Write a protein that binds this DNA or RNA. Structure first.
Ligand SMILES: Nc1ncnc2c1ncn2[C@@H]1O[C@H](COP(=O)(O)OP(=O)(O)O)[C@@H](O)[C@H]1O
Ligand SMILES: Nc1ncnc2c1ncn2[C@@H]1O[C@H](COP(=O)(O)OP(=O)(O)O)[C@@H](O)[C@H]1O
Ligand code: BEF
Ligand code: BEF
Ligand SMILES: [Mg+2]
Ligand SMILES: [Mg+2]
Lengths: 406, 417
RNA sequence: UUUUUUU
């Protein structure tokens, strides 16, 4: 008997058990309470958020990890006993309430025994590194969607702990690029913990993502205030850090981080100093720490963040935000509006796209092939570049056979 | 028996060492407690204890010996230095101190300093009589700090082009100016390697402010020197205090006639941190910089100088431009009017994967005749006249191909004839 | 007011 499981099952399945014992939120509360009279075990789970007083609540993914009526109370002694912090996934027995359910004991901390999670190294003390193991994006299945992933592997490689972004103007193909990322992440690397954080973007894109991606989708559409965007993103990035502390390879696909930085700018207190474009002089610190959370860890695991970014918006702010994040991350995949307006996809700007320390992600042969191909494409215009590379790649199914044509 | 030596050793060797002394079970308690209990037991035997750290004098007249593992911030193992000890040897903030220590007594929370054995790697008496950094007579850089390895390395190309475009002397006040992803950090790393090989006599420090954390570990495992860092995970308040400790430590070593070099990355972000903590003056410059915000970072950069009495302080720091934020153009141009050397890197050259992506015409060093021989300057002068009409990319492709033909710039000069 | 608007 689990709480969040009762919330998932339809109300019809609920009334069946409730009548046998004797709103949907109340009938669940009545089933759990009457069951507590029997003396049998009752359960609940969630992602922890530690308040200022020292206690915490297990937030629900249904509420985008915000406050909810079905949230479980976590006492400070429980947090101290297992050294819990915000972002930890906690499961265990609870008790009927006083207007809040309360956790009796925790069985699993981050899908693992609670005792093992106590002597772990904190995320801040993990030794950072440049990305070693690479996340190759190519499916090699011969599909038209694979072309996007194949050009990405040549232009800007992605590794574990990468801190990259997809820069483009509106309607250039950022989101669809990111959807193409998710498909290759789940098909090529099922081992990775895939999360998709959608901030201040379209409402049809989260439902499309929820059914397209194999993973978790946390969203906060543009129907939501900027303060909600910040709180939702903080919960997600803290949950990612906790899994990295358990040596997990977490990947966050953010869309968009430029709008996430805007939300911070609208929230930060006015400092009396404003950068070019209307960005407060202290507004970009927290977005830098968010994006900058992605890193490769020597002790094990990694956190990878690939986020979409806006440029050529006519607003100087987004140019400042892009350049700031560029100086924070180590990978950029640019997309040109001129290429996208000619219906040439992917609309990748090859000469601007690139990845730092790409030798740590590529074989020596692969590095030379991409180096030569880099020099050949550079003199061409951006449209002529893609149309040239699309045809050469279309001739073959995989990049390896393309390397052999050279 | 030293505190920081015990902090460096792994916990496994500490527990075994503590059990040999015969102590209550050390496996449960934290590593900090193992060291503390091990230090106390050694004090019970009557044997001496030792500690060390860089001094930071508080407002009340006493100070503490901060440790490098805390980025010279407040630490649990800080050693109290009494005011009488400071007056005896005229100690000031930044002085590296080593001496005998004792565990804290009842009602105390810190290790205390009994006797100071070494002040700035020297006899404590010599520190009493000294000329202060503020009174040292400044000079333009005299002694050349040549970066060229000469080993025919492909990485040496960056050092060779640097020597021709913007020479570096002892006491230089230089800038590696470029937009993001142009090659500033790796060029600073290339400089760090050249300093460790060609100038092991110099005291090398690498200060990393508000930059990537993976570059911190990359730097400390690459350079043969001390690395102090404060990544972008840290607030601006921490950046300032860490930078102030490092710059004062450099001034103290220069007072001992040492040649100190500080590779800072980035100084633009250090200037932003000062602008974050500066008191509002009611006057804001173009780009969102307070009218009084750049005085402190200007004195920091301006600390680099050549000293006639002996020693020097060199600072090679990276700066950002073309960020879309006018603030960084103000910060860069303000530092250019403070320093005397700029090595520009071009995003246009870097996008073509041409490295080092050096803007030759914009780079340069002031009073470079004081750092070059008569014929070396005449050869660099002719080389600039030839390179100037070329484009940014054509200039580097031309110069790198010519330099790659030879191992050293000297042989390259002999080819020019 | 300055900064932002703003080149
Ligand atoms: N790989 C692709 N193949 C075909 N069409 C594409 C592709 N990528 C983008 N597009 C076109 O671009 C339009 C908008 O792309 P989108 O990903 O929403 O850009 P952005 O996220 O930058 O707004 C889509 O309607 C689609 O028709
Ligand atoms: N000398 C060089 N040789 C090869 N690649 C370089 C060189 N300098 C820079 N790069 C490439 O540029 C990327 C970023 O350079 P970096 O030094 O971080 O620039 P910045 O410090 O200005 O951001 C590196 O990851 C590297 O791939
Ligand atoms: F309209 Be796109 F998502 F920038
Ligand atoms: F992004 Be670079 F380090 F300026
Ligand atoms: Mg989109
Ligand atoms: Mg850098």
């Amino acid at each position: 008997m689990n709480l969040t499981e009762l919330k998932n099952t339809p109300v019809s399945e609920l009334i069946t058990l409730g009548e046998n014992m004797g709103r949907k939120q109340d009938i669940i509360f009545a089933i759990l309470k009457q069951h507590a009279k029997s003396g049998e075990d009752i359960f609940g789970d969630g992602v922890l958020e530690i308040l200022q007083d020292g206690f915490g609540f297990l937030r629900s993914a249904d509420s985008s990890y915000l406050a909810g009526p079905d949230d479980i109370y976590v006492s400070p002694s429980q947090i101290r006993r297992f050294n819990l912090r915000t972002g930890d996934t906690i499961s265990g027995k609870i008790r009927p309430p006083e207007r809040y359910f309360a956790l009796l004991k925790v069985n699993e901390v981050n899908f693992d025994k609670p005792e093992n999670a106590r002597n772990k190294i904190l995320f801040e003390n993990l030794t950072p590194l440049h990305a070693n193991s690479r996340l190759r994006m190519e499916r090699g299945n011969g599909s038209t969607e694979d072309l996007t992933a194949r050009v990405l592997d040549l232009a800007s490689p992605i590794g574990r702990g990468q801190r990259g972004l997809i820069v483009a103007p509106p309607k250039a193909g950022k989101t669809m690029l990111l959807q193409n990322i998710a498909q290759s992440i789940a098909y090529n690397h099922p081992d990775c913990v895939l999360m998709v954080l959608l901030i201040d973007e379209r409402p049809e894109e989260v439902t499309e993502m929820q059914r397209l991606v194999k993973g978790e989708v946390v969203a906060s559409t543009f129907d939501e205030p900027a303060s909600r965007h910040v709180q939702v993103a903080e919960m997600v990035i803290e949950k990612a850090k906790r899994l990295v502390e358990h040596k997990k390879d977490v990947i966050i696909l953010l869309d968009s981080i430029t709008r996430l930085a805007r939300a911070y700018n609208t929230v930060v207190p006015a400092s009396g100093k404003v950068l070019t474009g209307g960005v407060d002089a202290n507004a970009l610190h927290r977005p830098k720490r968010f994006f900058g959370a992605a890193r490769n860890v020597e002790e094990g695991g990694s956190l990878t963040i690939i986020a979409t970014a806006l440029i050529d918006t006519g607003s100087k702010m987004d140019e400042v935000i892009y350049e700031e994040f560029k100086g924070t991350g180590n990978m950029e995949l640019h997309l040109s509006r001129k290429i996208a307006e000619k219906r040439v996809f992917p609309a990748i700007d090859y000469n601007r796209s690139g990845t730092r320390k790409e030798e740590l992600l590529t074989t020596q042969e692969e590095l030379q092939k991409m180096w030569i191909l880099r020099k050949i494409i550079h003199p061409m215009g951006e449209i002529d570049a893609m149309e040239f590379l699309i045809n050469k790649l279309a001739m073959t199914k995989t990049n390896d056979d393309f390397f052999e044509m050279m």
